[PDB]
Scaffold this active site. Structure first.
Site, PDB file in Angstrom:
ATOM      1  N   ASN A  13      51.058 163.347  15.776  1.00 29.70           N
ATOM      2  CA  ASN A  13      52.153 163.752  16.596  1.00 29.70           C
ATOM      3  C   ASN A  13      51.795 165.051  17.725  1.00 29.70           C
ATOM      4  O   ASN A  13      51.294 165.988  17.470  1.00 29.70           O
ATOM      5  CB  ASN A  13      53.417 163.849  16.159  1.00 29.70           C
ATOM      6  CG  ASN A  13      54.690 164.199  17.240  1.00 29.70           C
ATOM      7  OD1 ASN A  13      55.239 165.110  17.382  1.00 29.70           O
ATOM      8  ND2 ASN A  13      55.132 162.926  17.599  1.00 29.70           N
TER       9      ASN A  13
ATOM     10  N   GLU B  49      50.424 153.124   9.132  1.00 27.96           N
ATOM     11  CA  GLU B  49      50.843 153.954  10.296  1.00 27.96           C
ATOM     12  C   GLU B  49      50.071 153.148  11.580  1.00 27.96           C
ATOM     13  O   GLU B  49      51.082 153.145  12.650  1.00 27.96           O
ATOM     14  CB  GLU B  49      49.894 155.246  10.163  1.00 27.96           C
ATOM     15  CG  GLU B  49      50.836 156.271   9.343  1.00 27.96           C
ATOM     16  CD  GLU B  49      52.134 156.646  10.078  1.00 27.96           C
ATOM     17  OE1 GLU B  49      52.433 156.381  11.038  1.00 27.96           O
ATOM     18  OE2 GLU B  49      52.991 157.358   9.161  1.00 27.96           O
TER      19      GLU B  49
ATOM     20  N   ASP C 194      61.426 161.147  22.528  1.00 26.87           N
ATOM     21  CA  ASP C 194      61.757 162.408  22.427  1.00 26.87           C
ATOM     22  C   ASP C 194      60.663 163.420  23.249  1.00 26.87           C
ATOM     23  O   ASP C 194      60.541 164.529  23.084  1.00 26.87           O
ATOM     24  CB  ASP C 194      61.796 163.178  21.073  1.00 26.87           C
ATOM     25  CG  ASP C 194      60.464 163.145  20.371  1.00 26.87           C
ATOM     26  OD1 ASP C 194      59.217 162.483  20.916  1.00 26.87           O
ATOM     27  OD2 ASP C 194      60.231 163.647  19.286  1.00 26.87           O
TER      28      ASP C 194
ATOM     29  N   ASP D 252      52.528 159.686  19.271  1.00 24.66           N
ATOM     30  CA  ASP D 252      51.765 159.462  18.135  1.00 24.66           C
ATOM     31  C   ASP D 252      50.463 158.904  18.306  1.00 24.66           C
ATOM     32  O   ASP D 252      50.430 157.824  19.207  1.00 24.66           O
ATOM     33  CB  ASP D 252      52.516 158.909  16.911  1.00 24.66           C
ATOM     34  CG  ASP D 252      53.815 159.219  16.665  1.00 24.66           C
ATOM     35  OD1 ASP D 252      54.025 160.481  16.487  1.00 24.66           O
ATOM     36  OD2 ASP D 252      54.841 158.446  16.443  1.00 24.66           O
TER      37      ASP D 252
ATOM     38  N   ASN E 157      57.311 157.957  21.988  1.00 23.57           N
ATOM     39  CA  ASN E 157      58.654 158.223  21.332  1.00 23.57           C
ATOM     40  C   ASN E 157      59.569 158.807  22.579  1.00 23.57           C
ATOM     41  O   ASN E 157      59.381 159.082  23.616  1.00 23.57           O
ATOM     42  CB  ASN E 157      58.707 159.283  20.290  1.00 23.57           C
ATOM     43  CG  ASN E 157      57.805 158.898  19.051  1.00 23.57           C
ATOM     44  OD1 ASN E 157      57.882 157.954  18.492  1.00 23.57           O
ATOM     45  ND2 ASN E 157      56.712 159.718  19.148  1.00 23.57           N
TER      46      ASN E 157
ATOM     47  N   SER F 103      57.473 163.135  22.926  1.00 24.67           N
ATOM     48  CA  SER F 103      56.060 163.146  22.288  1.00 24.67           C
ATOM     49  C   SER F 103      55.595 161.875  21.843  1.00 24.67           C
ATOM     50  O   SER F 103      56.301 160.717  22.246  1.00 24.67           O
ATOM     51  CB  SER F 103      56.410 163.987  20.802  1.00 24.67           C
ATOM     52  OG  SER F 103      56.901 162.802  19.980  1.00 24.67           O
TER      53      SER F 103
END
Length: 129
Positions: free
Chosen positions: A59, A35, A48, A52, A46, A50
């Site tokens: 998230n 990760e 969208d 991480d 991201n 969001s």
């Protein structure tokens, strides 16, 4: 902070992740490796809306609140910046909740892709636990 393999394993074990809900310690180390490459400050923003956050790339849509993500549920009830600490406690506690809220470790794509079906024990082999 960028953790060493054995150093992260020990810290995760002190926080009770070994065999948490049936997932051996090596699963958690393996997940963090792919990760974030053990980097506590890793962020992935991201398309969208969001982001991480942190060593386990948690998230911001469901788990933490960064104030800029549509549909935020903040189920771990923490600001996302708390997940960027060199202390992994907040990330570990939220990861436990991610599993406790129904999910398995399938919630981490890197675990599904790079750890599932492999000898995850190799990630703690050689370490003083």
């Amino acid at each position: 902070k960028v953790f060493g393999r054995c150093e992260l394993a020990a810290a995760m074990k002190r926080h009770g992740l070994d065999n948490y809900r049936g997932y051996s310690l090596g699963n958690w180390v393996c997940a963090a490796k792919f990760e974030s490459n053990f980097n506590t400050q890793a962020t992935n923003r991201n398309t969208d809306g969001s982001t991480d956050y942190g060593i386990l790339q948690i998230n911001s849509r469901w788990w933490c609140n960064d104030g800029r993500t549509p549909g935020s549920r903040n189920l771990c009830n923490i600001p996302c910046s708390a997940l960027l600490s060199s202390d992994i406690t907040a990330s570990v506690n939220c990861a436990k909740k991610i599993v406790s809220d129904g999910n398995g470790m399938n919630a981490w794509v890197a675990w599904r892709n790079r750890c599932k079906g492999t000898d995850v024990q190799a990630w703690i082999r050689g370490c003083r636990l």
